[PDB]
Design a protein around this ligand. Structure first.
Ligand SMILES: CC(=O)N[C@H]1[C@@H](OP(=O)(O)OP(=O)(O)OC[C@H]2O[C@@H](n3ccc(=O)[nH]c3=O)[C@H](O)[C@@H]2O)O[C@@H](C)[C@H](N)[C@@H]1O
Length: 190
């Protein structure tokens, strides 16, 4: 098969996908719906892609497109999920889901709660989320690749953010991603 990776190039992920004897191409810029990049692609994986996939592409790749999203869906769809999970004191974790129209709303394939600890920062929690989802993907991709797996419908509810929603809270992040999370818990509530 031919896999299209949307998002940044990552050596471990290229090597993993290629170990199954699949053909792997990667792209991280805006993807026009008639682009030849999609010619003969059999499966789409997005991880870290910063553009919304065109609906015509989504429908064309029904049940052949997944997204690796570092939130516990349905909470924190969209942008900066790790940050919002502390600002809004929400469930924390990672989710692999089929891509459907709209913004991180598709069927859940598997998810995992990720805990945080005393002294964690936005950096340490983000890196933990990242390790969790990458191992989870490695565990499940053998099944996903063979269509040996289906999802369950993602419940409506949870939450959704856009990039600009965090602007009024940036002043709390005095150490950038090294800001301790304890300082942020629930700051967007009340
Ligand atoms: C709006 C958008 O398009 N988002 C991308 C993606 O973005 P991302 O790939 O995860 O990078 P982000 O911009 O969040 O961070 C860049 C770097 O800053 C560091 N960092 C950041 C935040 C944090 O809490 N702690 C921390 O340490 C770390 O090194 C990280 O790599 O997020 C996905 C969930 C979206 N599905 C989408 O794909």
């Amino acid at each position: 098969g031919k896999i299209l990776l949307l998002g940044p190039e990552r050596k471990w992920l290229r090597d993993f996908l290629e170990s199954f004897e699949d053909e792997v191409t990667q792209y991280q810029d805006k993807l026009d719906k008639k682009s030849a990049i999609l010619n003969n692609v059999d499966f789409i994986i997005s991880y870290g892609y910063r553009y919304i996939i065109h609906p015509d592409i989504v429908e064309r790749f029904k049940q052949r497109a997944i997204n690796l999203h570092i939130s516990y869906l349905p909470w924190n769809k969209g942008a900066d999920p790790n940050l919002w999970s502390f600002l809004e004191d929400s469930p924390k974790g990672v989710t692999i889901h089929y891509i459907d129209s709209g913004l991180d709303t598709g069927e859940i394939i598997v998810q995992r709660e990720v805990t945080y600890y005393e002294n964690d920062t936005l950096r340490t929690t983000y890196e933990r989320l990242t390790q969790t989802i990458e191992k989870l993907f490695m565990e499940y991709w053998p099944l996903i690749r063979l269509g040996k797996i289906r999802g369950i419908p993602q419940p409506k509810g949870g939450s959704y953010h856009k990039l600009k929603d965090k602007e009024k809270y940036l002043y709390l992040l005095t150490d950038g991603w090294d800001t301790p999370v304890q300082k942020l818990i629930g700051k967007a509530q009340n």
